[PDB]
Amino acid sequence: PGDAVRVTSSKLVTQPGTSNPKAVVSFYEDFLCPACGIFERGFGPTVSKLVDIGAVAADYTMVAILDSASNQHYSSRAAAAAYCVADESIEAFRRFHAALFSKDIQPAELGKDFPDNARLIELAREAGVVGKVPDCINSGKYIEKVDGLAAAVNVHATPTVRVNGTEYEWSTPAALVAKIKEIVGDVPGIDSAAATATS
């Protein structure tokens, strides 16, 4: 998946003869982007159920298009923190990625304070990891990578969603599930994925 964090479960359905997922949903997101927050709060539970029943691989590329000195470089620090978390644990990344887009945490784009690195570290702890994450965050390990990411993957707007490489104009979670079903068919649980309330 390249510069993305790939989230899958043991049940992942793959193309015959290969270990390639039958269905890949690609997300390009900025942790400071308000629409991304609404999108993830609205689709996250469905995508998590799709992953867990094995219907999709969910690939997350966290760009930093909104990053600026005026937001205390939150967009880049948050994305880089997420890559640090994924190095330790994909399960923790799922929780951390969801947490940063929650209503309690996602900062006002034009506000006067933003989670500092200590706060990002504490959020990673809550998502279930310490390990190398504190050093990874404090050293700015993935800052250069996330700053170059929008250019490297040629995505300049967020959120950008694709299904098997095809850009997807999203509306409802159920509509996304219908599209996945067209690809994977009757994966057990797929009908229930549509009506997933929480993650």
Author numbering: 57 to 255
Give me lines lifted from the publication on this model.
Here, the Mtb protein Rv2969c is investigated and it is shown that it is the DsbA-like partner protein of MtbVKOR. It is found that it has the characteristic redox features of a DsbA-like protein: a highly acidic catalytic cysteine, a highly oxidizing potential and a destabilizing active-site disulfide bond. Rv2969c also has peptide-oxidizing activity and recognizes peptide segments derived from the periplasmic loops of MtbVKOR. The crystal structure of Rv2969c reveals a canonical DsbA fold comprising a thioredoxin domain with an embedded helical domain.
To explore the atomic details of MtbDsbA, we determined its structure at 2.0 Å resolution. The two MtbDsbA molecules in the asymmetric unit are very similar (r.m.s. deviation of 0.26 Å for all Cα atoms). As in all thioredoxin-like proteins, the catalytic CXXC motif is located at the N-­terminus of helix H1 in MtbDsbA. However, the catalytic motif (Cys89-Pro90-Ala91-Cys92) in MtbDsbA differs from other structurally characterized DsbAs, which are generally Cys-Pro-His/Tyr/Ser-Cys. The active-site disulfides of DsbA proteins are susceptible to radiation damage in the crystal and the broken disulfide bond in MtbDsbA is therefore likely to be a result of the synchrotron radiation used to measure the diffraction data. Ordered active-site water molecules are present in the crystal structure at positions consistent with formation of stabilizing hydrogen bonds to the Cys89 thiolate and to Thr214, a residue preceding the cis-Pro loop. Helix H8 at the C-terminus of MtbDsbA and its interaction with active-site helix H1 are unique to MtbDsbA among structurally characterized DsbAs. Compared with other structurally characterized DsbAs, the presence of helix H8 in MtbDsbA buries a greater proportion of helix H1 (buried surface area of 592 versus 401–260 Å2). The H8 helix interaction may restrict the conformational flexibility of helices H1 and H7. Unexpectedly, a ligand, 1,4-dioxane from the crystallization solution, was bound in this shallow groove, forming contacts with Ile94, Gly98, Phe99 and Pro229.
